């Protein structure tokens, strides 16, 4: 039939059940969350690509993403996101 559609529904649902074990979510709220995730993704990716282009560099590493998230997110959000990202990268490198 019709082609497949990519969405962030299952992962947003997993996070919601991680933080609130009992509350649910409607379809329109799920679509709004999907749009929010896509918007933040494209903002961070564009900022990282511009950062890489400014330094005559061909790769987007974790340093570019960290600088992009400290340029975009404000204050406490920036610090907590940086902490979470570094924790995830350390866990990924040590476990593999």
């Amino acid at each position: 039939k019709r082609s497949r559609k990519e969405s962030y529904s299952i992962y947003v649902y997993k996070v919601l059940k991680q933080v609130h074990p009992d509350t649910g979510i409607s379809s329109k709220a799920m679509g709004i969350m999907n749009s929010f995730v896509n918007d933040i993704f494209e903002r961070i990716a564009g900022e990282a690509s511009r950062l890489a282009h400014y330094n005559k560099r061909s790769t987007i590493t974790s340093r570019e993403i960290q600088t992009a998230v400290r340029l975009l997110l404000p204050g406490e959000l920036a610090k907590h996101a940086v902490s979470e990202g570094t924790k995830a990268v350390t866990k990924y490198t040590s476990a593999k």
Partner: protein, 84 residues
């Protein structure tokens, strides 16, 4: 075979007063209805120009909601809840 002329008056005075009441306005002068209609028409035509340009670039004849979403994102007005 169909021409529509006097549709800017479809946004009636009670609708404008309702929109102003949601904004927090307590008492409303009698001349702001024409000003509101003019500014609404300007905003609508500004958005619709880009929307129709986006549709006609794709060789389509139907204005999809995603074209409206892109046209709004272009003017620094992001809209969540309609995909994209």
């Amino acid at each position: 075979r169909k021409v529509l002329r006097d549709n800017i008056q479809g946004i009636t005075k009670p609708a404008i007063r309702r929109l102003a009441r949601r904004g927090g306005v307590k008492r409303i002068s009698g001349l702001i209805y024409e000003e509101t209609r003019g500014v609404l028409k300007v905003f609508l035509e500004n958005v619709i120009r880009d929307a129709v340009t986006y549709t006609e670039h794709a060789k389509r004849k139907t204005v999809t909601a995603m074209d409206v979403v892109y046209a709004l994102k272009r003017q620094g007005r992001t809209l969540y809840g309609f995909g994209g």
